[PDB]
Amino acid sequence: PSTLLKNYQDNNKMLVLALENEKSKVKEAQDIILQLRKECYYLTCQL
């Protein structure tokens, strides 16, 4: 009855840490997208 709860416990640091890591990754990808958007703009300016 103990280890079961203890498992759910570790399983949750695990999942949360992961969620927080993926969230981190969407934000970094958003920065790539903003840069590229800027680059498309600068490049179309010289057309």
Add this chain to the structure above:
Amino acid sequence: XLXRXXX
């Protein structure tokens, strides 16, 4: 109860 972001 006004809007979750908080009555």
Add this chain to the structure above:
Amino acid sequence: PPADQEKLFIQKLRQCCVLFDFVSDPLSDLKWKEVKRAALSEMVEYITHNRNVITEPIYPEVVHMFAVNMFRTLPPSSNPTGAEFDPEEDEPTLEAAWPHLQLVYEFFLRFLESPDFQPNIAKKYIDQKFVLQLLELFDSEDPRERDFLKTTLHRIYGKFLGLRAYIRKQINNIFYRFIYETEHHNGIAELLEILGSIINGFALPLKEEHKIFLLKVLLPLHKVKSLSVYHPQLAYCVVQFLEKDSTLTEPVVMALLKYWPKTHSPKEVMFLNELEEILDVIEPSEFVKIMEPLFRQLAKCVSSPHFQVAERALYYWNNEYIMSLISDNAAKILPIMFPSLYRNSKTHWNKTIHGLIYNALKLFMEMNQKLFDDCTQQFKAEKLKEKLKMKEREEAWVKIENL
């Protein structure tokens, strides 16, 4: 049996004129409340399924039964008033006599909806006086009451040509008072829903009365603080007129420009949203008339520091049809839009709208390659215009020593 039925009906209408107290004494008369509750309950079922019972004498008996139950003075507001309160956040305060009130409403409705119902026989009793007191009821705090009233007045409007002019004039009065005197009324939405359906019904070469009604009543409804409560239904009413007669679009768009919120952001988003729905119906001919004033505003909005204002504006670019009207008018629109989104390309606190202005600038150059950065050429024409200004005032003040 075939007759003493008609006497027993009237007898029960009478007994339903006894008003009961649900507020002051909430524990009183439980038994007799039920008696009444049952009494009009069966009267619904009675008139609902059966037929040929709306006989000539029961008309006054019904209208009177309604009036004595429905037409009271509404109590003091249960909500605080003032500049620091949003009526959207008001606690729902319910009509405590709804047990009886619902069934009076439900009844008078079936009484109306019967195919055996004779208008020009009832009209003796449903008169202007009745309508006025019915109209007063729309300020009820209870949404269920307002809901029934909406449907009831909507029927009455449909079935009595005599009363149509009066009903129009009377609700107009209600709005004028709301817009120009009190800025408080609970039933604006509901009255507009009725009006929406009424706008659709209107006839081909739109009548002057209704044009005036759009320009003088519906547009100014836009200036009141609590627009969010009824804006959808207001926007609908407006859009329908424009569908019915396209020549109305310049005045309406010019009006929305005239009323543009300077200190109320949710309303700014509300206007932007309403205007787009308008552009979704704009004949190109009517578009050429209002583009420049329109986009001088959109320029202000796009450069707005308020992310929800900027966003909603910039979202106009995801509209294929708007985007094409921009395209084959690009001559005029681009030199006014450009400075705005250029000043905000170098830097921005909000990354999303930063992304959206970069995209927007892209779509503009794809329309007509415009290396036209005689943007700063205007920034000088404005420095000179200011030097001529200040040198004019000099002359005027030094001409105060006067004749």
Add this chain to the structure above:
Amino acid sequence: DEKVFTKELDQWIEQLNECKQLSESQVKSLCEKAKEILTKESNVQEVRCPVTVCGDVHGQFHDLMELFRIGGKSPDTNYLFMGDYVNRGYYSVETVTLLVALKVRYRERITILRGNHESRQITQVYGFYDECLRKYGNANVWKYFTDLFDYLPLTALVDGQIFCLHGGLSPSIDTLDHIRALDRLQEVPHEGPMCDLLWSDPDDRGGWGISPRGAGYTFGQDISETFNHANGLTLVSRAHQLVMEGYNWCHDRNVVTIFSAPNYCYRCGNQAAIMELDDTLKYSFLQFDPAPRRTRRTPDYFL
């Protein structure tokens, strides 16, 4: 050694006590002066032992005045405010500018932390932005105050023992040093530790969990107990969630919620509270109600 400026400040403060805003050029100067003092304060500010600790205020100036009536005048008694100075109330301009004012006159007597409403985005969807606009006619004062919010410390530590912050705990955070290592000089991010600290709520679901607010996390007793034991804290003191008694214990008293805006948005009917930490760090709470509140407006299309 000239106090020409403290005369000027004393005037600004006196004015503000009469619920009168400062001017554009005064706020700008105020924030400029405020930045320089805040910048030298830590992500986890060390706060001296006798203080009175306060929850949310949200522009309810007259209730802040009421707070001072319960607590004592803003020099004589030390205060620590846990953020959230600006949104739902009718007087956000007067409230934040007063509190900043007090901080620059008495940097040692008052500490002000960042809450989740001290941020460009939140300040726009809720009142503050429009308040600034109808009280000044432009977005400058907003720009100065929001620029200033990036400089507010995230957390306080009273006597190495009572951890003070607006939101609650973070999965990315296990120690104060994790907090000290952050770069706070920025807009509140949508995700991450800085965000969690201003957004999270404790709850009764004994672990990390999804926040019903679109941000931060919920957390149960076991996090609090670990976090307290790991850092040698006797109590987590926090302030971002309305409580009807103005203050609320939970998690076997590892955390307290303090909330200082009575009858929130003038709707909620809650009591407010503040907590006094005395010379020997014994606590006591003071609850209080809203203060006795003693034409047709200008059209919103004017300016």
Add this chain to the structure above:
Amino acid sequence: DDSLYPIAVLIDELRNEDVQLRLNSIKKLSTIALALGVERTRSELLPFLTDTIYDEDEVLLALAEQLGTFTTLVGGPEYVHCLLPPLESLATVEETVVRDKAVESLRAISHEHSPSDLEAHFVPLVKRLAGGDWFTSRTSACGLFSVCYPRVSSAVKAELRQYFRNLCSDDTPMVRRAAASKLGEFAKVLELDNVKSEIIPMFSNLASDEQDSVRLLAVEACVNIAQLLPQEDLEALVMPTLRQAAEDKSWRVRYMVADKFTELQKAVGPEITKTDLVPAFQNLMKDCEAEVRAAASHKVKEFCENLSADCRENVIMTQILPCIKELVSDANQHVKSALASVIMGLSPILGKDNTIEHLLPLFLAQLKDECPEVRLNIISNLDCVNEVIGIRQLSQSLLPAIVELAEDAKWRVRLAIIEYMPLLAGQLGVEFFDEKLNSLCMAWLVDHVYAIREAATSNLKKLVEKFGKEWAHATIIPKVLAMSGDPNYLHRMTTLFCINVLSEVCGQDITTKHMLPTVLRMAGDPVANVRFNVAKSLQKIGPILDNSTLQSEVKPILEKLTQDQDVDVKYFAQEALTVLSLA
């Protein structure tokens, strides 16, 4: 630049797109006019502002304001009528606030019109406005009648009366509302037998209007109307209409009556009050609607205080008193609240024995009400009761309840009692006070809320002013100083705040011997807040002391604090040395 150059610049400025720039022009419109002739102002600028100006409501609002101040600029009273065309237009404008300024400006300049001009220019303006197509023009007109009327010929007066009458019977409630608004104003300007013959009918019709929003405005008018008129005309005319409003189906109407009730009582005079206003008031105190009952409650003492000298006892004791008793246990917090704030003022009216018999139990039920606002409102006016009944009687009947409220849950109630203590103590005397009430006052100093501490502190100064400095030395001082060893800095500062106050009136000796020593020891308190208050406190009591004490004792300690590690201590020390001239 030539003759009309200043107008060209204005045109340019109103062609601008920055609305703000257009405003600055309009704000500087009197400079334009001065630049121009007086006659170029008249025959060119004025017409320009009339025809050639289409713009936003904010600009029209400014123009309205400017035009209200242009009389001299246009050539003075010989020429004010020039201003009317512009103002007539603005009076027609949809936006409420713009047309309101327009009216305000029109009223102002009317006084500059000769009666001829009022007849040839101003009155026609009122006609056009009052008979205009839209309700905005018509509502504007209602504001203009009472400034031209007293100064025009009787034929013109007959016309103004007709138009005013037409407005009162508009198809729209918007105009009817605005009319009823200006009915009293207008009445006050009519010749009296026109009040009787033409205003009464107007008033009667509005008072029975279908809309209750109109009807309630007729009540306000009834007051102005009754005040212009003597006992006998009231009975035929305004009274049967007034008696109706008090029974109106609309609580909004019944509320005005209740709210305007004493004003009505005066206006009508004691005779009709007795016959008509007594039953009405009773019914209003029994209204089904609480706001009405509350409103009426507010008037209970006023009404009674103005009843005729003869029947005063019978009516109060037999008609009003039992209503009051009923109202004391009303369900609604707020009607009970209203009553509690005026009921005690009844005492000097019923006299000693009646108060003790009838009023007292009431006071006691209100002194223990569950609603804090009730009990706050009933503390307010206790002295007025002490004047009618004895102080002996007071301490027997009410003192026990007052003592209970000294430890009330809500601090504002606690404060009410504190602010009343000094007066009350004076009346009981020292031997009574400091046997039965001393500790109670001392406890306040140690109360959880600052405000209570604060109040109890100045209270000390008031006490010493009636008991003198040696009662202070033996009774107050040592408990006050005992507080300098409280573990809590918050209560320690109380000791300083108390000394600040007590020094002012205990005199040099007591201060120096018994207070100063405690202040100087506190200079070494572990907590800065205490320390800088020792500075503030030495500043304050400094002048009371001999220069030798100041010099050998105070100065060193202040100087020691200027060396303090803490910025606020250092500042307040430096400050005390400047002020005391020990720097």
